[PDB]
Amino acid sequence: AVADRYAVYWNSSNPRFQRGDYHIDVCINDYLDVFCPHYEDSVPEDKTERYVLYMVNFDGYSACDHTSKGFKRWECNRPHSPNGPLKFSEKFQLFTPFSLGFEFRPGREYFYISSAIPDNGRRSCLKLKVFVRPTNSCM
């Protein structure tokens, strides 16, 4: 319908995560779908990419730190999941009907990062910036 839907394939083989400047401009009430890495069952666990997806503030986004300033949004620990890749869905709505949900405002920026499973000490985390566009730009 009227809203737009964005699909992000969140894995280290996606060249959009390359420079660490992957961003998308969305409108209020738009959708974002994030897909976990998925592999044929013959691929062993240790050779598959797994992680936790966090929503963090700008500071956490910059330093790849989810601990002091982040919320867990999704877990990609099923690389062989039935029915295809696990899919995280977000709607950029003003008000959440979920007491642990997340709210969005026009004109503001939001940040996601992933932390690998199993955990290494890297600070080369995959990340995404989401800019929620002003109301005037979204009719």
């Binding site: 977000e90 959440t96 007491s99």
Partner: protein
């Protein structure tokens, strides 16, 4: 002596074949359950819009030979007073419906074919304070599905202007 699920919204397969009417009503949005497991939830909050009549229909559910069928709902519901933008009058209930059917596919959705089981209320509505402090104000409501004289049935949820997150829907019988 043991429960057998006919439908679980938290399993990958259980959340397939659901339909919203209309779109932009009930939405499929990632959330978390009471066991800190990220799951698909079903949410609606169109209180900044007029004349809402949002339906959510589950996949077809077999009744097997089971006599008594239960539906377990886990949800959060927002206090209307805690919502900065409300255009009409916000509700703090939603409706549960069912419809018996022999067919799991090719069934055009028709509201008038659905029988109301109950109006669902929240023992606890959450506010901005709950949002800010990250409190999970989870409600649990168990109902029974009416007489099913077909091979199975669809369940449906109706929203008429409430701010509701369906965290979990589980349909089951006991053995």
């Amino acid at each position: 002596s043991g429960e057998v699920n006919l439908l679980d919204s938290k399993t990958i397969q259980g959340e397939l074949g659901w339909i919203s009417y209309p779109s932009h009503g009930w939405e499929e949005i990632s959330g978390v359950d009471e066991h800190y497991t990220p799951i698909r939830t079903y949410q609606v909050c169109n209180v900044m819009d007029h004349s809402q009549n949002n339906w959510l229909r589950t996949n077809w559910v077999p009744r097997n030979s089971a006599q008594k069928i239960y539906v377990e709902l886990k949800f959060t519901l927002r206090d209307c007073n805690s919502i900065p933008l409300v255009l009409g009058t916000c509700k703090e209930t939603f409706n549960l419906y069912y419809m018996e059917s022999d067919d799991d596919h090719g069934v055009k959705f028709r509201e008038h074919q659905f029988t109301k089981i109950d109006t669902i209320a929240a023992d606890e509505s959450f506010t901005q304070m709950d949002l800010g402090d990250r409190i999970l104000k989870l409600n649990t409501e168990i109902r029974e599905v009416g007489p099913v004289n077909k091979k199975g049935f669809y369940l449906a949820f109706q929203d008429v202007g409430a701010c509701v997150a369906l965290v979990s829907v589980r349909v089951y019988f006991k053995k």
